Amino acid sequence: VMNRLILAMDLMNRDDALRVTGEVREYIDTVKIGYPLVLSEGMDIIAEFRKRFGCRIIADFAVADIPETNEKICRATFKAGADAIIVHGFPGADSVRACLNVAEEMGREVFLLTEMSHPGAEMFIQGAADEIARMGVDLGVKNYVGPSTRPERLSRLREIIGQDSFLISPGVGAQGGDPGETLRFADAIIVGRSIYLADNPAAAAAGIIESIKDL
Amino acid sequence: VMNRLILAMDLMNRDDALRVTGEVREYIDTVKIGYPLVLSEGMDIIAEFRKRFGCRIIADFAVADIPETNEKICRATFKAGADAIIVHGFPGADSVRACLNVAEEMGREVFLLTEMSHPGAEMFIQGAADEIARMGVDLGVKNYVGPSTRPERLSRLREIIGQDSFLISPGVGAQGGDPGETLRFADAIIVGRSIYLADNPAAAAAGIIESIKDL
């Protein structure tokens, strides 16, 4: 990923989202689009972004349903032009497999969300996260998400998935995570508010990249 | 809920979804709309259904993100006209609270998904589900979802949430659950494929209701 930095584009207005993404496009090659934008502007926003910016799009849909519904969600998401989809592992192996099957058929990728970055992840997800990661490995998952806010957990995640697997990490900036420390373990960092709420998003992105280059 | 039966409308085509919902409208007063339909036809489908059928709409979006993103998802969903939203408890109390805060502000309801109905729920969710339910009670949640496929787990869920709380239950029909047994513990059952894939959905719905009335 260009500069190891993925923009989390969670503005809810098409005009604001396009403005900020355009301002920072020189510093990224990958945009994570989630439900805040999609549910406000429609699934057509994915193909609009892919065309206008020539970026890769990861659909962060935190997919967390039964296998049959997961199948339908992934089909709709890839039809809309997404390059990859984020899928929760907590619901279990059959729900993850359903997503992997659709990605295989459609020539796309699944990212497995292991531990989440916010405080409430400590209640239930953290105690299952090592096993969720090991399930991922067993299923042949090659792309994972884990938390910038807990680099010791990110290290343990990396330990389970190996060096060949690709690991991206949210929680940098607003949630308290640090770019450089997170990039000790993750291949790329996800950054939302620290860039898209900044008075100057391009300057915020540039500032992050300057600290990344220094690594 | 009319006849204690909620239609899970997971067809992906607006014309098919409207046809089937119209055919069974005399037997329900509540439709669960999820991502298969929304991501295929847009969020405007919610207000279309609410107008055309005068039904209540539960948005089954299995909300499973960090508090700030959950807030945005709930805001977009209620703006679209949903009466209630389904929210995972597995991510923890702060993520659930975020949804409860938006529901309070917008005069809507949150349903907390405890244990899921599919086989993979046994891996991670089932071992946390009692505690997820108890978290719900502590947060003041009054509406819950639990699995038709495991009535002993549905009983234990009901035990935790009490008789005043409202409990709806998917997994009836296609996934192997039974209407009558599930209604021993749940207030209403959710049914998707057994109705919407039937050669005659109205006859399928009527058949279910006839077995419900007999209880």
Ligand SMILES: O=c1cc(O)n([C@@H]2O[C@H](COP(=O)(O)O)[C@@H](O)[C@H]2O)c(=O)[nH]1
């Ligand atoms: O564990 C996770 C999983 C996520 O998807 N995310 C998502 O990553 C982004 C984080 O953005 P921000 O930099 O504004 O905190 C948001 O889109 C959030 O929904 C996260 O923060 N933590």
Ligand SMILES: O=c1cc(O)n([C@@H]2O[C@H](COP(=O)(O)O)[C@@H](O)[C@H]2O)c(=O)[nH]1
């Ligand atoms: O534990 C759960 C949670 C769900 O939301 N669901 C949803 O309830 C519906 C079940 O439909 P069906 O009757 O076709 O199996 C689907 O929309 C599914 O996504 C479920 O089956 N089990």
